């Protein structure tokens, strides 16, 4: 009886492939031939943040575009004032093996997690004046890879148990569970409207998840290796992913297929983080080769290189206003570029 | 602007407090040597953890040797996919890999352990991480070899051609067959580790039992040797 279902599954996959091929009337590169190239893009270090003892693995920009939260595997979740470089807070994490951090849109709460199976929520402005764990989210059976706040009460978290979950901070329960992924989920990206989010996994596939319906609306399998990063296009109709492929790929939700691929011969190492500028024209991705390559989202060419890191670049983030891009690396330093 | 200057002064005071706290934290952190404990589920890793101590994803044990603090992390409640979360332990002083040497025939878990050791050794991010190889369950291996239940001759056909190294130092009263099997198992891992030939990291095999009381001393000696070798290589002495 098992084999009978597999013929159905293969026929469905072939039908999806045929539909995607039919919808591929023209490629993005061909239509993009007659647009003005972006040209040379140059950026150098503007602010150097120091104080982390171990390798930095995750970071996130605040909504104000001035506060920065960085997570290091030494057990410190430091909050930095980018404009003045001052360290607003230095939160000592219960578990030193933190693999993710998130800044709430209102800035009232900060989340983090890692190998401890627990996504800790920290309140920054408690009336007592100190920073303390508002509540710890537990229930995962893997390693927390990424997390992002939908609101001050709802947070989406990704874990190494191959499932993503939506948590209610007030009650600490899982509002919904996402189990469509087969491999380890590595990154999350919330849409501008927060209605849908895309999660990359080690199964070399990206899935578009509906927050309320608790299901994947679409699945993408453009990449051939583990997907480490994912980021929505600013309009929310497309997203880009980073993987061990050493290449970046762009997907559109409406087209339900890959649009563009960013690759180059001299690049053979994996990709850790990816982000989009405010306009979405520039695609910035972090690489294991200790430098970040700026890719034109349309021309499929490298516009600039950020080689101001002495170790693996593990995270990347662009301010909401797009003024500057901050990159973290294993060298325990954060570089802000403009 | 007076309000702005007051705000900057408050931010600078907070920065100074945070820097003092981070300096103290750096001082305490540098004094600690982090270790990663790995091994098969059927291995004596749990027994070793219990001896050293005497569903969270990471279990940490505190133990001190010669007034030197060590943090050993046991990766539990984690899926068998290790290629991702293993990268978090690139900066650990050493990786204590526990292998059930007697599991050469009980599916042969020894081959799986060898493959895992090879993957750890050849990882790009673990090139600078030394591995402390604990060949656990030596008593069971010796009992099985003496009792005749051992069939490693066909499981590992290289055993027939293999011979006991002259450098071997068998314990008193140890049967020649037991020594031969032990050193063959050790050389199986030495082949993988010696293959790199880079000198950035080294393997430290040890014949240990589940309830061995010298495991802490072995770990301390391995860490000291690793640090000494790193310093010597830095000064072109190795």
């Amino acid at each position: 009886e098992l084999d009978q279902l597999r013929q159905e599954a293969e026929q469905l996959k072939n039908q999806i492939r045929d539909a995607r091929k039919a919808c591929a009337d023209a490629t993005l590169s061909q239509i993009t031939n007659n647009i003005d190239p972006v040209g040379r893009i140059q950026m150098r270090t503007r602010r150097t943040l120091r104080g982390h003892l171990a390798k930095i693995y995750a970071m996130h920009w605040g909504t104000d575009s001035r506060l920065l939260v960085s997570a290091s595997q030494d057990g410190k979740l430091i909050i930095w004032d980018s404009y003045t470089t001052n360290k607003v807070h230095a939160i000592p994490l219960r578990s030193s093996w933190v693999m993710t951090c998130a800044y709430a849109p209102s800035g009232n709460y900060v989340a983090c997690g890692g190998l401890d199976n627990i996504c800790s929520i920290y309140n920054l402005k408690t009336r007592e004046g100190n920073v303390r764990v508002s509540r710890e989210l537990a229930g995962h059976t893997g390693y927390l890879s990424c997390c992002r706040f939908l609101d001050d009460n709802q947070i989406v978290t990704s874990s190494g148990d191959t499932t993503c979950a939506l948590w209610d901070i007030e009650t600490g329960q899982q509002t919904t569970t996402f189990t469509g992924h087969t491999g380890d989920v590595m990154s999350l990206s919330l849409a501008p409207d927060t209605r849908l989010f895309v999660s990359g996994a080690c199964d070399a596939s990206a899935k578009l998840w509906d927050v309320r319906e608790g299901m994947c609306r679409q699945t993408f399998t453009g990449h051939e290796s583990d997907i480490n990063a994912i980021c929505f296009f600013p309009n929310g109709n497309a997203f880009a992913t980073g993987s061990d492929d050493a290449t970046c790929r762009l997907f559109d939700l409406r087209a339900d297929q890959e649009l563009m691929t960013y690759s180059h011969d001299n690049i053979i190492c994996g990709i850790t983080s990816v982000s989009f500028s405010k306009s979405g024209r520039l695609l910035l991705a972090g690489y294991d080769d200790f430098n970040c390559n700026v890719w034109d989202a349309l021309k499929a060419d490298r516009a600039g290189v950020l080689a101001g890191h002495d170790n693996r670049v593990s995270c990347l983030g662009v301010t909401d206003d797009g003024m500057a891009v901050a990159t973290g690396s294993w060298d325990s330093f954060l570089k802000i570029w403009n | 602007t007076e309000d702005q200057r007051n705000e900057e002064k408050a931010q600078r005071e907070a920065n100074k407090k945070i820097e003092k706290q981070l300096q103290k934290d750096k001082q305490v952190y540098r004094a600690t040597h982090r270790l990663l404990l790995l091994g098969a589920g059927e291995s004596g890793k749990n027994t070793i953890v219990k001896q050293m101590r005497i569903t969270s994803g990471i279990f940490e044990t505190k133990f001190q040797v010669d007034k030197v603090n060590f943090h050993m992390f046991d990766v539990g409640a984690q899926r068998d996919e290790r290629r991702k979360w293993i990268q978090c332990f690139n900066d650990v002083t050493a990786i204590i890999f526990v292998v059930a040497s007697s599991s050469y025939n009980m599916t042969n878990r020894l081959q799986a352990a060898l493959k895992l050791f090879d993957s750890i050794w050849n990882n790009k991010w673990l090139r600078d991480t030394s591995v402390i190889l604990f060949l656990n369950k030596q008593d069971l291996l010796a009992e099985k070899v003496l009792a005749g239940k051992s069939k490693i001759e066909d499981y590992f056909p290289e055993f027939a051609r293999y011979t006991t190294p002259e450098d071997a130092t068998p314990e008193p009263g140890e049967d020649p067959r037991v020594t031969r099997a032990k050193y063959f198992i050790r050389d199986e891992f030495l082949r993988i580790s010696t293959a790199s030939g880079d000198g950035r990291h080294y393997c430290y095999p040890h014949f240990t039992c589940a309830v061995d009381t010298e495991n802490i001393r072995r770990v301390f000696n391995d860490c000291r040797d690793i640090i000494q070798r790193m310093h010597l290589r830095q000064y072109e002495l190795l």
Partner: nanobody
């Protein structure tokens, strides 16, 4: 889409010979080390053999070296495993496994319970 498929199998008397074919598509075959793993009835997944990207380096498990032979063809995007002198205990589903990442010597999770880059395999039975 990373897809791996196998061909060949069926009932074979002990001491016979069989050849497995692994059809790979959706990824650059030449940039990934390939592996063969098997899962006997009621037992866990056991690694069998591996082939380097260029095929120059070859290794087999202790109970398989010499008896079997692994070969790859980067031009046709196919991998082969010449199963010669099958033993009765060799009966198992042989999976054509790909390493998680290209250019990396480490191949950690080929034997994992729920690996994603594995070939699903064909049942092999060795009996009279």
């Amino acid at each position: 889409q990373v897809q791996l498929q196998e061909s060949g199998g069926g009932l074979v008397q002990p001491g016979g010979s069989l050849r497995l074919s692994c059809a790979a598509s959706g990824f650059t075959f030449s940039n990934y080390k390939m592996n063969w793993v098997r899962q006997a009835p009621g037992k866990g997944l056991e690694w069998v053999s591996d082939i380097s990207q260029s095929g120059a380096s070859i290794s087999y498990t202790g109970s398989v070296k010499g008896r079997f032979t692994i070969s790859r063809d980067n031009a046709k995007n196919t991998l082969y495993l010449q199963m010669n002198s099958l033993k009765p205990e060799d009966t198992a589903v042989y999976y054509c496994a790909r390493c998680p990442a290209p250019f990396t010597r480490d191949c950690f999770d080929v034997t994992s319970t729920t690996y994603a880059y594995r070939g699903q395999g064909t049942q092999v039975t060795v009996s009279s």
